[PDB]
Amino acid sequence: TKLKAPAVLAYSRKINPTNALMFAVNWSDRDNTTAVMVGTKTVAGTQSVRGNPNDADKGNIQTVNFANLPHNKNTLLVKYNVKFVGDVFKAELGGGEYSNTLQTALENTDFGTLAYRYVYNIAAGRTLWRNRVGAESIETVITVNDQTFTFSDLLVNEFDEDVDVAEIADMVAGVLSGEGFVTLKVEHYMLLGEGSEVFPSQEFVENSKLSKQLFDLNGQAAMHDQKIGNAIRTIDTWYEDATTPIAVEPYGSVVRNGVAYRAGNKTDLFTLMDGAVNGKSLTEEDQMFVTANLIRGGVFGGGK
Amino acid sequence: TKLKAPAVLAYSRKINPTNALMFAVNWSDRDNTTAVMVGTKTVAGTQSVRGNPNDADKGNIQTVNFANLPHNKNTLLVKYNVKFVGDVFKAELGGGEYSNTLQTALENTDFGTLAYRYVYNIAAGRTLWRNRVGAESIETVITVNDQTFTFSDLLVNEFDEDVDVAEIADMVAGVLSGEGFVTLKVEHYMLLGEGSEVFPSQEFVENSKLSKQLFDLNGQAAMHDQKIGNAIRTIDTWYEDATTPIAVEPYGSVVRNGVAYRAGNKTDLFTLMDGAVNGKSLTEEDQMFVTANLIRGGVFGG
Amino acid sequence: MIKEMIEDFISKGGLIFTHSGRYTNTNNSCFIFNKNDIGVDTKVDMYTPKSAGIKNEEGENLWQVLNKANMFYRIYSGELGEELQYLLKSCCTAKEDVTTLPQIYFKNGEGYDILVPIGNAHNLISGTEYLWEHKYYNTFTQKLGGSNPQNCTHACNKMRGGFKQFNCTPPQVEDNY
Amino acid sequence: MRKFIIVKNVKVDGINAKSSDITVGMPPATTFCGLGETMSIKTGIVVKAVSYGSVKFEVRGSRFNTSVTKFAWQDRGNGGKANNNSPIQPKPLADGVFTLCFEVEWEDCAEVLVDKVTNFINTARIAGGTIASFNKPFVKVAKDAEELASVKNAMMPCYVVVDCGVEVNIFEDAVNRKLQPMVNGYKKLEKIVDNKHMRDKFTPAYLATPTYTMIGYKMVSNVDNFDQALWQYGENTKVKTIGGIYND
């Protein structure tokens, strides 16, 4: 009767970013780059914890990683690549019937908009996260298919119209809508000032020697591929009471803040996917949300 | 009933100093800077603890880091930059309602006084800590927005009125009370004397061959950005029975003296924050203190 | 006490295994008791809900008793009677479960088998203790079944310090060449 | 005669560094043999053997503890819980730079082979890790054991993996022989009955557990017999080197 979902339905991710390496340059001398190295320092502080005042007179010594621009370079340079891949509907472990009728129900999905918002998050430098705070200007250089595009200061929380973002979203939507691949080589330049703190990815480790460990590749500050990924796929402006774009998540999850904007309101990925497969009609943006979840990849479990 | 604070309500710091580098110049030839390098030396001493006189005949060897001006330069030059960042009421991690009603409760905070006292701590040279002792004179240079300002003769422990401090604090308060950012670029020149011991930031290393270790960057003596910052936000003269300004800490903690001038008397940041969100009224100086804690940054949740 | 401990274990979920997918994922509950592996020293893992079970006068539960003094072999091989042998053998039942587990193809005589790997209890209980004895330090420490270990496995529940994994980092070409 | 294709400096970011429950780090030979077979399936080129070497490698985390990856919510029936951090299994990741060499059956011209190889690599991963950049693959050939040495040194520089077998067992050999365990194959524990939940509806399925050997890393140069460092599938659902156990 009802076409139910497999026990596990799995898709691979289709936006594949690399690690972001962090160099230091001068804004008007971008061909003399030097790597930003992770260092270690002592940090003494107080016990300023909301709970207990009875131990605020004691201190706490700590040691942490830190990363800074040198005192003779004013510009942070962040480098990475992003590979977009097609065949966004070939399941990796899910069955045949459910996945194929879903591929059929979603072939009319607005891929131009998804490609635009991906490329736009890349070009405006949302992937730079806290490295955006306090920048004089941000300049993004994207090299794709022997073409070089330059982007100056761009509004991140609005997907404002730009002819070059659209010109790259052309090829990106062409690959996503069909098959093949396309690789963008991305550079970011931020004018922060000589000696400014940069913000590499923070490590999630049980390490008693450090209170804060920054991600490093042979000592050089870097950012996790998965964090750049979480930045790029932040395109969801379609949940109820929508304010700012959030990352494509099956439950609209922002565990960061302790809320999920798609929990228990008929608008989660599984409700909408069961709808799409079982004959129901989908909004253009519900189609976009479900297909963006497929682009995200995942191992969606539960069912029979 | 009560607006409970979200468990992960946190603000990011808004006064961002860099690490300070330590050079040596001559007082009247400031274009010939050479860097102060951290060295290592043996130090032999006595066992002179208050407790045991039985070890008073025993010695002790150590190796320690040390930092001196050369014997041909008489002036220490400390360099750093400080970036002030606005949106001091937009929370980093906390949700909406608690943070939004707190932002509404504090829109009448004296941003002029906050900016003035920050800029003043920078201009009077409090950020130099022990490098201020024994100076024939101190000369501070702050550059901001293609404008240069020089300071000599400023009392560190009093917020005396000064026209240049106020003129810089104007831009600083324009950023802190609105949006945007601004970078003050700071140099300090101290006439200490040739060969003078200088005082970089000290490190802690569990067990090392070194008993006392100094903060260096590529071998050059330096000061932690957090130490300069702690000097910058020493503006709190509003705790009970206040003598001198203390650094803005939610409990007014001064761990170096083992006391907390705002702990356990309904003057801490958490009591005042709860009151402000839950209808109760704050003094003008209490609004200043709470906004200064928001500019400090930190986690304000269970 | 011993028969009583075995019976108390049987009353609850009572599973005895030498391989499991639960080391890979706390919500797997796929257990396998490879008979051909049982030797005089083979360490064994057990599952029971919340890792509950009576303690003997020295404070040990069944998992701790069976992995001392080759007790599990002496019972499994009939050296302590057929009542205990039956009771212990009855728990060594398999539990198939493939969800969440990895699946690889592997070339078998110019064809392919699908392999679903599960971890071996002996190599972690025994080899952790062994690398600890022989002062082998080239290792990562990995605690299994986080925060609530007793909901996972008796070995995880009573070895909360973690299991040792061989740090398989390769040598790196130096920067200068 | 004997043709090889080499791809140097394969920067890979995001490797699934857990090869088994007791080995975390360098991806094992099973992984690179599976990569070679995937290429064989996807291009049609017959792949005799593969030899891989580490140029750079780093497991994420500290010296004695691997990094955690932040699990995102993924399963049905969890909406009442997606407002909190998802529970979390261990999944150590790593980052590295490798050099690969595939022995292939090729009769055509080198340009066609190189282009097909590149077009495959552009669609692949390595042990789950995203391939960020690789050099242009190039072909070499060997008749006698003299040109084999040139093919060998063409991979320079990198540390390749040789199989030195197991004397006692993994743990005793690690302690005494100062070598490194490595997943070399699998042992079948039980046949899986129903392919309801498998990658195939038809392929034979088995629950398995890894089998290891004891390996060593050596500079492709210092290796004498290059066959001792070329890995391929084979007997008893393991993998091994063309030249057997390493002792020249």
mmCIF file with all atom_site columns, C-alpha atoms in Angstrom, chain B residues 114 117-118 121 126 159 231-240 242-254 261-262 267 285-286 288-290 292-293:
data_model
loop_
_atom_site.group_PDB
_atom_site.id
_atom_site.type_symbol
_atom_site.label_atom_id
_atom_site.label_alt_id
_atom_site.label_comp_id
_atom_site.label_asym_id
_atom_site.label_entity_id
_atom_site.label_seq_id
_atom_site.pdbx_PDB_ins_code
_atom_site.Cartn_x
_atom_site.Cartn_y
_atom_site.Cartn_z
_atom_site.occupancy
_atom_site.B_iso_or_equiv
_atom_site.pdbx_formal_charge
_atom_site.auth_seq_id
_atom_site.auth_comp_id
_atom_site.auth_asym_id
_atom_site.auth_atom_id
_atom_site.pdbx_PDB_model_num
ATOM 1  C CA . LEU B 1 114 ? 33.192 53.298 29.431 1.00 0.00 ? 114 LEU B CA 1
ATOM 2  C CA . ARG B 1 117 ? 38.117 54.810 30.832 1.00 0.00 ? 117 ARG B CA 1
ATOM 3  C CA . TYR B 1 118 ? 39.218 52.183 28.298 1.00 0.00 ? 118 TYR B CA 1
ATOM 4  C CA . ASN B 1 121 ? 43.915 52.998 30.622 1.00 0.00 ? 121 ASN B CA 1
ATOM 5  C CA . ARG B 1 126 ? 48.464 50.877 32.745 1.00 0.00 ? 126 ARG B CA 1
ATOM 6  C CA . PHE B 1 159 ? 40.592 59.148 35.576 1.00 0.00 ? 159 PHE B CA 1
ATOM 7  C CA . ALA B 1 231 ? 44.693 46.383 32.061 1.00 0.00 ? 231 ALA B CA 1
ATOM 8  C CA . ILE B 1 232 ? 42.363 48.011 29.506 1.00 0.00 ? 232 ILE B CA 1
ATOM 9  C CA . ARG B 1 233 ? 39.147 47.022 31.319 1.00 0.00 ? 233 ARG B CA 1
ATOM 10 C CA . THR B 1 234 ? 40.339 48.062 34.810 1.00 0.00 ? 234 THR B CA 1
ATOM 11 C CA . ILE B 1 235 ? 37.535 50.627 35.108 1.00 0.00 ? 235 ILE B CA 1
ATOM 12 C CA . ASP B 1 236 ? 35.351 49.236 37.909 1.00 0.00 ? 236 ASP B CA 1
ATOM 13 C CA . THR B 1 237 ? 35.109 51.808 40.718 1.00 0.00 ? 237 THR B CA 1
ATOM 14 C CA . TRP B 1 238 ? 31.503 50.915 41.563 1.00 0.00 ? 238 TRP B CA 1
ATOM 15 C CA . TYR B 1 239 ? 31.739 47.916 43.892 1.00 0.00 ? 239 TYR B CA 1
ATOM 16 C CA . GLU B 1 240 ? 31.041 48.496 47.573 1.00 0.00 ? 240 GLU B CA 1
ATOM 17 C CA . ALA B 1 242 ? 35.674 50.909 46.321 1.00 0.00 ? 242 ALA B CA 1
ATOM 18 C CA . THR B 1 243 ? 39.215 52.249 46.649 1.00 0.00 ? 243 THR B CA 1
ATOM 19 C CA . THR B 1 244 ? 40.975 51.823 43.278 1.00 0.00 ? 244 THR B CA 1
ATOM 20 C CA . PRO B 1 245 ? 39.529 50.591 39.974 1.00 0.00 ? 245 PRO B CA 1
ATOM 21 C CA . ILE B 1 246 ? 39.512 46.824 39.539 1.00 0.00 ? 246 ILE B CA 1
ATOM 22 C CA . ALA B 1 247 ? 39.233 44.837 36.327 1.00 0.00 ? 247 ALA B CA 1
ATOM 23 C CA . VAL B 1 248 ? 35.688 44.110 35.152 1.00 0.00 ? 248 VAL B CA 1
ATOM 24 C CA . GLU B 1 249 ? 34.997 40.519 36.240 1.00 0.00 ? 249 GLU B CA 1
ATOM 25 C CA . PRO B 1 250 ? 31.507 39.108 36.954 1.00 0.00 ? 250 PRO B CA 1
ATOM 26 C CA . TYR B 1 251 ? 32.474 38.566 40.607 1.00 0.00 ? 251 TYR B CA 1
ATOM 27 C CA . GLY B 1 252 ? 34.965 41.445 40.749 1.00 0.00 ? 252 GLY B CA 1
ATOM 28 C CA . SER B 1 253 ? 37.689 38.876 41.316 1.00 0.00 ? 253 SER B CA 1
ATOM 29 C CA . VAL B 1 254 ? 41.285 39.840 42.033 1.00 0.00 ? 254 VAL B CA 1
ATOM 30 C CA . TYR B 1 261 ? 34.882 42.619 45.723 1.00 0.00 ? 261 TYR B CA 1
ATOM 31 C CA . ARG B 1 262 ? 31.471 41.719 44.213 1.00 0.00 ? 262 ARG B CA 1
ATOM 32 C CA . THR B 1 267 ? 26.460 43.056 43.435 1.00 0.00 ? 267 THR B CA 1
ATOM 33 C CA . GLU B 1 285 ? 26.874 52.645 37.330 1.00 0.00 ? 285 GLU B CA 1
ATOM 34 C CA . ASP B 1 286 ? 25.302 49.182 37.568 1.00 0.00 ? 286 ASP B CA 1
ATOM 35 C CA . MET B 1 288 ? 27.810 50.485 33.138 1.00 0.00 ? 288 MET B CA 1
ATOM 36 C CA . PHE B 1 289 ? 29.150 47.441 35.010 1.00 0.00 ? 289 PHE B CA 1
ATOM 37 C CA . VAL B 1 290 ? 26.791 45.005 33.280 1.00 0.00 ? 290 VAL B CA 1
ATOM 38 C CA . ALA B 1 292 ? 31.286 46.236 30.658 1.00 0.00 ? 292 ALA B CA 1
ATOM 39 C CA . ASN B 1 293 ? 30.823 42.548 31.475 1.00 0.00 ? 293 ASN B CA 1
#
